[PDB]
Amino acid sequence: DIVMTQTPLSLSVTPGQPASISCRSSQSIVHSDGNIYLEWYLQKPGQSPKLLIYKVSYRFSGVPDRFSGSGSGTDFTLKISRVEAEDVGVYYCFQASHVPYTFGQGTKLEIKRTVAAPSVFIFPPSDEQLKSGTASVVCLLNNFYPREAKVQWKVDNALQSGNSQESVTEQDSKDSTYSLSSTLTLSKADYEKHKVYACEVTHQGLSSPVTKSFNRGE
């Protein structure tokens, strides 16, 4: 089977600056009709791949002129003349010349932008959840850049360990920012034992940590 190898594995580009992704096939990918069926796809998290380039250089409908394809034999290149926020995601080359059809491992394109401090929001547990015997407190860090952000849960000013989970979003396709959700989970009994619930946020856009808190029963 033809092995498709992409270079680099990932790249960080400032908007307006050019980008290049190479695809090397283990064998020649010249189909019986003389044409090389080498395609470029862009995939974003939670979505199916989108065709950008087909037959080495042809662009699919709606695909900007910023994207161009070239290559011969084994070496193949995707070129983004000027990178835009919306180009974020994973790029894959794909050969449809020889059965079985094969894909490259993918190239993650990330984009560079100015520092953006997060908007910090806190959410006490719902009465529905409290009735079920559990209390989850959610801390939302919205639209920040860079992705590195530190969340610290404090209960009656005491630092929490081992009772929280967090996940960061993929990079936003419109404003190149990230969002973070952190949830502190306690039992109903433990939650009622304390008053002040706070999440303390550290980020490059903040000169000092920002605390978002609430008093239980207010």
Binding site: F123, Q129, T169
Partner: protein, 220 residues
């Protein structure tokens, strides 16, 4: 308008079988070959094979021969892909895709179907509101959402106002808790001035457990 609608996510025990459906519409079903593509962790995306919808004739990738069985129903314009003797290695998103040009360069894809192969039992999530308040406001905006807690396996999909509300939506990747159960949050930033006139409903779907919850998020 070409569209490929696949069946919902499933969870099957090791040794079992699953038939993933792909309903085709907006084009003549018998005109284009139906392809199947697997997107597995580590193994990336791979081409499984193609089905000629006219005669049911199939061409497979050697790797999937004996594992995958491709069929179709012309009366319903639906292509099928059945996976036999499921093993953990079969946990993947399965896509049905076509090339409307006549050649095998795919331009239209189904939304995908996540098949999880696990001995662990399915659990539907509890949907809790993340009510907007003075503690979730910033520069005239109010953040609200839904906490989708304790579910297995993945995925949970969330839409807002039946898909009409897409701006400022952040549906976070799921977190795996020590119980082996997943949990995720979906948030939206809206104007704080219209909290009394607008209705915000998160539409939660967890197909492996047949969970369909429409949760109205009330301001507090």
């Amino acid at each position: 308008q070409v569209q490929l609608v696949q069946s919902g996510a499933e969870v099957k025990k090791p040794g079992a079988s699953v038939k993933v459906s792909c309903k085709a519409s907006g084009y003549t079903f018998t005109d284009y070959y139906m392809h199947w593509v697997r997107q597995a962790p580590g193994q990336g995306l791979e081409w499984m094979g193609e089905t000629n919808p006219r005669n049911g004739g199939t061409t497979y990738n050697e790797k999937f021969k004996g594992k995958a069985t491709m069929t179709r129903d012309t009366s319903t314009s639906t292509a099928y892909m059945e996976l036999s003797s499921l093993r953990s290695e079969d946990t993947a998103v399965y896509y049905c895709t076509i090339g409307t040009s006549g050649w095998d360069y795919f331009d239209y894809w189904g939304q995908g179907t996540l098949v999880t192969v696990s001995s662990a039992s399915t659990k539907g999530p509890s949907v809790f509101p993340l009510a907007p308040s003075s503690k979730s406001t910033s520069g005239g905006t109010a953040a609200l959402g839904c906490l989708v807690k304790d579910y297995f396996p993945e995925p949970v999909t969330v839409s807002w106002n039946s898909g009409a509300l897409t701006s400022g939506v952040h549906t976070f990747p799921a977190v795996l808790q020590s119980s082996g159960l997943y949990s995720l949050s979906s948030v939206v930033t809206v104007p704080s001035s219209s909290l009394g006139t607008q209705t915000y409903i998160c539409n939660v779907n967890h197909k492996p457990s047949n969970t369909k919850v429409d949760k109205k998020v009330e301001p507090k």
